[PDB]
Design a protein around this ligand. Structure first.
Ligand SMILES: NC1=NC(=O)C2=N[C@H]3C(S)=C(S)[C@@H](COP(=O)(O)OP(=O)(O)OC[C@H]4O[C@@H](n5cnc6c(=O)[nH]c(N)nc65)[C@H](O)[C@@H]4O)O[C@H]3NC2=N1
Ligand SMILES: NC1=NC(=O)C2=N[C@H]3C(S)=C(S)[C@@H](COP(=O)(O)OP(=O)(O)OC[C@H]4O[C@@H](n5cnc6c(=O)[nH]c(N)nc65)[C@H](O)[C@@H]4O)O[C@H]3NC2=N1
Length: 766
């Protein structure tokens, strides 16, 4: 092959140059307003040294099965086998666990970002196969908004976090003050769950062009601060709820708040006020009290409050601040403050929880929705971040949103499209708990830490080696794209669909899994359903072969540019109620009161977390801002040429303030040891005043590279920040992860020299 083909990914729509059957360049779509620089690593990931070539079986597992020594998982001692031998083995283990232990013995949650595509959806295909096998245990919720997605339904009656926002053009005309609270939209808008349209960049440009006042509340001076030249407030991490309380107190004491919005559209403020004023605990939540906890000057807190009440203000909040202990309080308190300001439902005012993710706010079109392949459908479901608790405590009870259940006794886990050996918290705890599993099977196209720890590893293909169909724009529904095959499958890789169809055949359910269709048969069935709906809806669409030839169909915008969140509620609350018990915004919740949880009271409350910067009696001195990477999508693309632009002496970078480096005798470029009571990792330092003093930045997603897998607490040589995090729930209400509640110490490294081993394939898979 020679020529150009159009396809897409989590980073955008692109055109590939193909020279003699090798892809040589990926060029952005000409209609993409702001392409991501990561595209070059996407191309590289097809061919890099960590591409998985053949099916492999861990030697100890091949030789002894259930009696293998499970403490050597991760050491790289693999044996190459034929596909027929691998598929027979996988089918035999699925059958054995289902027959001996039941559906409760198989964990199939398989959390992960995978790749877009309606047919080649590896995690849905995994559940489709396991359902035909007898069943499995599944996961509930996600690692992004684990706390916020449970508390919003109790407060505003809807999910809220993954719903369309007041449109960007409406903000440009009406907003006077734009606040980015714990959000860095310049960094996080580069990717989409489905294909991204990068709709936030023109939206942010328009705010800057109109001269709107922008305020950023974040411990790091990010690209969003720089882009706008914004006013920047730097709180100590995990203290945002205290600042919010101090603002609320100020509005009450100066008699500025909207008493009519409070009286007519909310419920429970009378129960919250005594707490705010200090009647219940002798502690008035003043701006001065708030300064003592957060470090932000009391006069600044009062001035911000006054400004927000007197101008049309939009509170745009990100999700880092609820990915922490007691994380439910942050967005519950933000909605309470927004109710006191009284602008919810007005054009350009109120709050928004998705302006930093997947285009939220880009005007929606009138096109039809596209559907894909389905899954065919102790506890049968657990909160996703309780996976290690589950393995350590089979049969024990756990609390979750008002209900009590028991953990299932799992013996096998099957993971595709995810990297738990990078994404889950407390790596050393996790490594020890994984010994409880008899069998661990993984599919991926790259040799991640998760692939290196499996018993059986099967090489998948990338999206660039097959055909598929997907929507452009999670919220905008801009159009539908043909994700055309670019190169033939490499080495001995197969799509997840083909792997699962062959396992299903072996369990005698081959026809139920494929439904008699092939790749193009399935894709046309999804496209005809969307074209039929479109017709009902008056939206014209071509026939499938003609759509495939063009490669894309775009839809028209009708009234999408005028959408204003909460306008009909504001217009008449009795006629357009919220989904809560009272029909109003619940500041005090009687349902949460009845649950009786000590770590989630019935109104927003300041509570001390497990550990925080400058907390009374804190052991470690620095907070780690363990946030999302600028030049990776989580762990994706770490094993590519992009690593060279950011690694420091080959390690993952650590940003540190000049005063904190000087006290430790550390210089820019030094290799350092970052440690606490849970673990120890190596990173390379970059000295900068971009991080506030007392905070260090190490992004999540680095590929864990242990020195010796049989040594408890072994040093990670590359820089996986989850070796340092604690694995606990946000509270009994949501049970979300706390991946950003982390303190540690840093010292110059003085041990033996080290050789990095995570970016080349295991010797036997070469
Ligand atoms: N380039 C890129 N890479 C990705 O991996 C990526 N992941 C996607 C995913 S799945 C999601 S879930 C979203 C995540 O979007 P999310 O809002 O959770 O992003 P983070 O990078 O964890 O945090 C954003 C900001 O919060 C600041 N921050 C941290 N702690 C605090 C605090 O206590 N208080 C305050 N006020 N600020 C704090 C950080 O410094 C950071 O600038 O991004 C998505 N987009 C992504 N883009
Ligand atoms: N400390 C900390 N702070 C955080 O802010 C934080 N963020 C959390 C969040 S919000 C999330 S969403 C998780 C992300 O954790 P997640 O496991 O989703 O991360 P990825 O690096 O996207 O792993 C995706 C894997 O799927 C593989 N893959 C892609 N396409 C295919 C395919 O078609 N077939 C197969 N078989 N494999 C494929 C990729 O190669 C990659 O290895 O991290 C969480 N972890 C976090 N920890």
């Amino acid at each position: 092959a020679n020529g150009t083909v159009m396809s897409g990914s989590h980073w955008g729509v692109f055109t590939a140059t193909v020279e003699n059957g090798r892809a040589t360049a990926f060029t952005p779509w000409e209609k993409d307003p702001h392409p991501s620089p990561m595209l070059a690593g996407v191309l590289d990931s097809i061919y890099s040294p960590t591409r998985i070539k053949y099916p492999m079986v861990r030697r100890e597992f091949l030789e002894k099965g259930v009696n293998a020594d499970r403490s050597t998982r991760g050491n790289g001692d693999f044996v190459r086998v034929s596909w027929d031998q691998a598929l027979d083995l996988v089918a035999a283990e699925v059958k054995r666990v289902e027959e001996t232990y039941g559906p409760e013995g198989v964990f199939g949650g398989s959390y992960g970002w995978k790749s877009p595509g309606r047919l080649h959806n590896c995690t849905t295909l995994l559940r489709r196969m396991l359902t035909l096998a007898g069943g499995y245990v599944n996961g509930a919720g996600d690692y992004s908004t684990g706390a916020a997605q449970v508390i919003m339904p109790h407060v505003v009656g809807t999910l809220e976090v993954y719903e369309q926002q007041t449109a960007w053009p409406v903000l440009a005309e009406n907003t006077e003050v734009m606040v980015f609270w714990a959000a860095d939209p310049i960094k996080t808008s580069q990717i989409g769950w489905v294909i991204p349209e990068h709709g936030a960049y023109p939206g942010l440009e328009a705010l800057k062009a109109k001269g709107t006042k922008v305020i950023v509340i974040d411990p790091v001076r990010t690209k969003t601060v720089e882009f706008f030249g914004a006013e920047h407030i730097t709180p100590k991490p995990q203290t945002d709820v205290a600042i919010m309380l101090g603002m609320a107190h100020t509005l009450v004491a100066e008699d500025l708040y909207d008493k009519d919005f409070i009286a007519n559209y909310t419920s429970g403020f009378d129960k919250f006020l005594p707490y705010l004023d200090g009647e219940t605990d002798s502690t008035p939540k003043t701006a001065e009290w708030a300064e003592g906890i957060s470090g932000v000057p009391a006069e600044t807190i009062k001035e911000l409050a006054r400004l927000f009440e007197s101008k049309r203000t939009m509170l745009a909040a990100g999700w880092s601040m609820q990915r922490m202990h007691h994380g439910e309080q942050a967005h519950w308190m933000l909605v309470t403050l927004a109710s006191m300001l009284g602008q919810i439902g007005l054009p350009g005012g109120g709050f928004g929880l998705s302006y930093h993710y997947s285009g939220g706010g880009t005007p929606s079109t009138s096109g039809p929705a596209l559907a894909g392949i389905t899954d065919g459908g102790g506890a049968s479901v657990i909160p996703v971040a309780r996976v290690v608790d589950m393995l350590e405590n089979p049969g024990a009870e756990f609390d979750f949103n008002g209900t009590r259940s028991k953990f299932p006794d799992v013996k096998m886990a099957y993971w595709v499209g995810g990297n738990p050996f990078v994404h889950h918290q407390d790596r050393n705890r996790m490594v020890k708990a994984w010994e409880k599993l008899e069998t661990f099977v993984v599919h991926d196209f790259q040799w991640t830490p998760t692939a290196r720890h499996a018993d059986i590893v099967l090489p998948a293909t990338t999206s660039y080696e097959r055909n598929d169909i997907e929507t452009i724009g999670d919220y905008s529904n801009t159009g539908i794209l043909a994700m055309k095959k670019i190169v033939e499958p490499l080495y001995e890789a197969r799509s997840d669909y083909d792997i699962f169809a062959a396992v299903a055949e072996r369990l005698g359910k081959g026809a139920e899994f494929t439904e008699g269709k092939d790749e193009m048969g399935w894709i046309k069935s999804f496209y005809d359903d969307a074209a039929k709906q479109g017709k009902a809806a008056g939206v014209e669409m071509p026939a499938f072969d003609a759509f495939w030839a063009e490669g894309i169909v775009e839809f028209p915008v009708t009234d999408g540019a005028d959408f204003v969140r909460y306008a009909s509620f504001r217009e008449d609350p009795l006629l357009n109620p919220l989904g809560t018990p009272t029909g109003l915004i619940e500041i005090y919740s009687k349902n949460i009161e009845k649950m009786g949880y000590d770590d989630c009271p019935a109104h927003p409350t300041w509570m001390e977390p497990l550990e925080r910067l400058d907390g009374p009696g804190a052991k470690y001195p620095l907070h780690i801002a363990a946030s999302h990477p600028f030049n990776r999508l989580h762990s994706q693309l770490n094993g590519t040429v992009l690593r060279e632009g950011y690694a420091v002496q080959g390690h993952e970078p650590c940003l540190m303030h000049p005063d904190d480096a000087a006290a430790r005798g550390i210089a820019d470029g030094d290799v350092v040891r970052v440690h606490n009571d849970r673990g120890q990792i190596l990173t390379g330092v970059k000295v900068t005043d971009a991080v506030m003093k007392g905070v260090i930045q190490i992004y999540e997603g680095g590929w864990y590279d242990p020195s010796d897998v049989t040594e408890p607490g072994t040093l990670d040589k590359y820089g996986d920040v989850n070796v340092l995090s604690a694995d606990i729930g946000t509270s009994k209400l949501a049970q979300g992860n706390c991946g950003q509640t982390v303190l540690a110490e840093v010292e110059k490294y003085t041990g033996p020299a080290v050789t990095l081993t995570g970016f080349v394939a295991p010797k036997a898979a070469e």
